Symmetry: D2
């Protein structure tokens, strides 16, 4: 089949394991406590400028200037603020998004996620490796949202369900762009080369699951005992 | 004086030699040949993708987000593809700009300039070294155009003068941005480091002279001995 | 004090947590399972090529040619074997070393360690970060093994105590080298920068603990 | 024919020009003077460390450990000193090597060459780009020195002949290693990629021609006018 779809098939048991894990399950039935959600926000904000830096590192890896335009736009979007799914999470805790992130966290998981992406952008000439590393989302985020709407255990009464509504639609653009690039780039690559890329993708897929478990566990570096 | 003013000071003897070299001189009188203008644009257009790359690499070196927005504009400006001074040089040869750059050339002088800038981007952590490599591009051009306005040898009947009129104004805004970045970053640096930075800036000055001269001499790699 | 001692002082709680984790405690008593030694040997041999690359990447960052002569020797060392601590460990499983490492393993824990190191080699001009990131390795192994020599729990009637005897001694030259380097580089640096270097150091300390813990827990990527 | 021979055959007209240029000719007759020799020795020493760094950066791009054992050996040889050709040259300037290189110079021609090799080392994942950039150096010297043995203008009464006698032999091992690495690595590559590798190699041949020239002309960065 097509390469990006080969990725999606391998990613199934993980999105499955992410869906049945504690973050998603708890978001689903409305019972998720504002402490876990605080950890998730502070970290996302903390790694913000890293994501910005990765798109810019993608630019010299490009060829078509149409793809460069898009990377500018994604860099543009993040600096331009306006995080909608974040204010829905800000609602559930009941404090503003900006006030929560005045404190920041750099947990061992986010650190592991960020350096996985950076290793690809520093060590690997072909863009597909960086791109495969940043792709597992919002692909994962979208697929979770769609499993939500069909699911009858979904709690629609609370403000947890407005999170799922966001990722069902608004992630779908950049998924296609990443899908185009990866599929286009894989045409000339060998089977051995492509197995690496897939591994890059699936490691990132785990990093998402670990990122949610990080939020739930209030994870940090323990240097003091 | 401010650190960047010491840089301008040092640059004067070179900026002078450039002004007195055949390119600008033959640009002043308006007698310059479509030969050299063709070579000039072709080299410059082949290096278009490379300058887009350099503004991208500077982003992860930027600690201030207003600095990042600036670098973003320069990429957008390069993606939009509006080159005013180039369309001016095109009509003098009498072909459209797209026809001329359909053929590209990649001369030694230009190779050395590019590789100099990439060396900073690639191996130097501090954004001051790359910027200092890039700065003598909009400064020198503005300075020559400003000299030509008070010069009685400037032939105002010829269309070559429109080129000068463009560079006496349109470069001013980006210079000051490079000027503020350089001056800001030099504050925390040892005097010896600044001796390196100054060296980097001065080589670029030299490459500008060499680039112009390459167009006059229709320079290229001769591998055929 | 010197900067490197400041690093050693902060590394203490972590080193203690490592000593009281399962790997060292079971290494002391002799009763450590062969599953874990197996995973430890394979994860360590899979990451060998990476450690080669990191010393190599430190060379352009050096100035002195004596520092270079050192980095060269460590790679010349790594080529050859002289894996005597590992030669000892393979006797405990009862398979030969070469037979064990025929299948390499590539655990998430190691992955995070390696990439943390590489990050320094790739993104930081000054060598001190990449050195800070690799320094916990000899220093931690040394300390734990020094501790074992004053510790009555250690079973000298099992072959596992030969591990500690090796690491009580044979790391000491490379620790001094590293110690010189960090101390000399720190002189010219601000307090803020050294706050980052210390953080890089302590993370590898943590990575060291997770490396051990991973052999114990047979850690791997579960894609299925 | 094997890939490296395609390279060797293309290098011929550039090697012939280098042979006919002033440095080698004056080396031949023995009338080359201390000025140019000193400048050659100074530039060469000044770039040692850099050529040393490059071997190191080939390591992470290496597949097997025997290629690494070689690279280590190269760095091991540069650390230990023992420059036989350089001592032959120092005798002619009538001084000691260590005295001559106490003063160092980094001329434009040298700078361009160095930045050419580093560009390959920083931006190109595949080892073949960096090796092809470094391969012309030993190879050219070998070819030059072998040609002198059949040349009756070779002045056997001056120690300049010992300079050729050395390069006629002592470069062969490393040439052969590089030849094996380039052949092996080329097998997996498209013809289009190989055209770029050939371009790097030939660019390095030209740089060799300019390095000798820079020495005869006492080249330096001219910032003063």
């Amino acid at each position: 089949m097509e390469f990006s779809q080969k990725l999606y098939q391998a990613a199934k048991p993980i999105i499955n394991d992410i869906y049945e894990d504690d973050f998603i399950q708890k978001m689903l039935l409305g019972n998720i406590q504002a402490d876990a959600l605080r950890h998730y926000l502070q970290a996302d904000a903390a790694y913000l400028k890293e994501f910005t830096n990765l798109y810019a590192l993608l630019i010299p890896k490009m060829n078509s200037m149409n793809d460069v335009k898009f990377l500018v736009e994604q860099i543009e979007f993040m600096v331009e603020g306006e995080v909608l799914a974040h204010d829905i999470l800000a609602q559930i805790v009941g404090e503003s998004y900006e006030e929560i992130i005045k404190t920041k966290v750099w947990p061992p998981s986010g650190d592991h996620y960020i350096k996985h992406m950076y290793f690809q952008a520093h060590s690997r000439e072909n863009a597909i490796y960086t791109i495969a590393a940043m792709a597992p989302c919002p692909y994962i985020y979208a697929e979770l949202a769609k499993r939500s709407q069909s699911d009858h255990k979904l709690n629609r009464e609370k403000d947890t369900a407005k999170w799922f509504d966001f990722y069902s639609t608004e992630m779908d653009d950049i998924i296609n762009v990443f899908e185009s690039l990866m599929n286009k780039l894989a045409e000339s690559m060998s089977d051995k080369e492509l197995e690496q890329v897939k591994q890059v993708f699936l490691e990132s897929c785990i990093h998402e699951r670990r990122f949610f478990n990080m939020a739930m566990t209030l994870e940090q570096w323990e240097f003091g005992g």
